[PDB]
């Protein structure tokens, strides 16, 4: 039927069976269509913010004759869902900052029991910080690459926020991923090894620059980051 990318395929696998899912900023409503068609989800909501992506999602769902189980809605983030409407929420193809913003702006729509499957393009840390604060528990993480690009997928549900971080510092865990850190797969090492190298270059770059209170502060943070990364790729 519909084919999904490795990235969204990964996301779909965490959808609880018979779950009603809400895909925020749904890409053509493919993921939700795919989930409902494969009976992974019982029903779904596909949220779009702009007119274009909205009409096109509505048309695909209509074209696919999935209007009966899929509701394409227009709105900002979780603005499209009603409290206790969905059992799983997927937010992918966005930056960690946005995802965290979406979650925070619409946490009124959350009961807390909904399973969150978040796929940040970058700065997954913003999501972990938000999750820890709203006490959620990370139940799993995956990091893979597709078409020469690495992508992370975070899965969370109500639970004990510290559990997943047992054995690792919140500081590091939140940045690289507690589960990811334990796994230490090729994609993970490559991503963070490069990040560290990039951090060192800025450190040495700022090092040669002026000796100002500002640059020394900027260096302190780079150092903290470097040591942090060093501890995760040992
Ligand atoms: Ni960020």
Per residue, the 3-state secondary structure of the chain, as one string, reads CCCCCHHHHHHHCCCCCCEEEEEECCCCCHHHHHHHHCCCEEEEEEEECCHHHHHHHHHHHHHCCCCCCEEEEECCHHHHCCCCCCCEEEEEEECHHHHHHHHHHCHHHCCCCCEEEEEECCCCHHHHHHHHHCCCEEEEEEEEEECCEEEEEEEEECCCCCHHHCCCCHHHHHHHCHHHHHHCCHHHHHHHHHHHHHHHHHHHHHHHCCCCHHHHHHHHHHHHHHHHHHHHCC
Please indicate, yes or no, whether residues 129 and 184 belong to a single structural domain of this protein: no
Please indicate, yes or no, whether residues 117 and 220 belong to a single structural domain of this protein: no
Per the entry, the structure determination technique was X-ray
Please indicate, yes or no, whether residues 156 and 55 belong to a single structural domain of this protein: yes
Please indicate, yes or no, whether residues 89 and 136 belong to a single structural domain of this protein: yes
155 CA from centroid of ligand 1 (Å) = 19
69 CA from centroid of ligand 1 (Å) = 35
Please indicate, yes or no, whether residues 130 and 232 belong to a single structural domain of this protein: no
**Domain range spanning residue 62?**
1-164
The C-alpha atoms of residue 38 and residue 66 are separated, in whole angstroms, by: 12
Resolution (Å) of this entry? 2.0
Please indicate, yes or no, whether residues 133 and 174 belong to a single structural domain of this protein: no
CATH code of residue 133: 3.40.50.150
| 41-48: strand order across its sheet | 70-74, 41-48, 19-24, 88-94, 115-120, 149-157, 137-146
178 CA from centroid of ligand 1 (Å) = 18
Is residue 96 a contact partner of residue 120, using CB atoms and an 8 Å limit?
A: yes
127 CA from centroid of ligand 1 (Å) = 9
171 CA from centroid of ligand 1 (Å) = 15
30 CA from centroid of ligand 1 (Å) = 27
């Amino acid at each position: 039927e519909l084919k999904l990318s490795k990235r969204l395929q990964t996301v779909a696998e965490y959808i609880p069976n018979g779950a009603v899912m809400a895909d925020i900023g749904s890409d053509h409503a493919y993921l939700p269509s795919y989930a409902v068609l494969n009976h992974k989800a019982s029903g779904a909501i596909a949220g779009e913010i702009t007119d274009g992506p909205f009409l096109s999602a509505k048309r695909q769902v209509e074209k696919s004759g999935l209007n009966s189980h899929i509701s394409v809605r227009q709105g900002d983030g979780l603005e499209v869902i009603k409290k206790g409407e969905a059992d799983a929420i997927t937010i992918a193809g966005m930056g960690g900052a946005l995802i965290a913003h979406i979650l925070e702006a619409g946490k009124d729509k959350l009961t807390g029991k909904e399973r969150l499957i978040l796929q940040p393009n970058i700065h997954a840390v913003h999501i972990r910080e938000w999750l820890y604060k709203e006490r959620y528990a990370l139940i799993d993480e995956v990091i893979l690459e597709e078409d020469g690009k690495s992508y992370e997928v975070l899965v969370a549900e109500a639970g004990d926020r510290d559990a997943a971080y047992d054995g690792i510092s919140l500081s590091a865990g939140m940045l690289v991923g507690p589960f990811l850190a334990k796994e230490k797969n090729a994609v993970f090492l490559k991503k963070w090894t490069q990040e560290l190298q990039h951090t060192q270059s800025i450190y040495e770059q700022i090092s040669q620059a002026a000796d100002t209170e500002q640059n020394k502060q900027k260096l302190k943070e780079l150092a903290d980051r470097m040591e942090l990364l060093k501890e995760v790729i040992d």
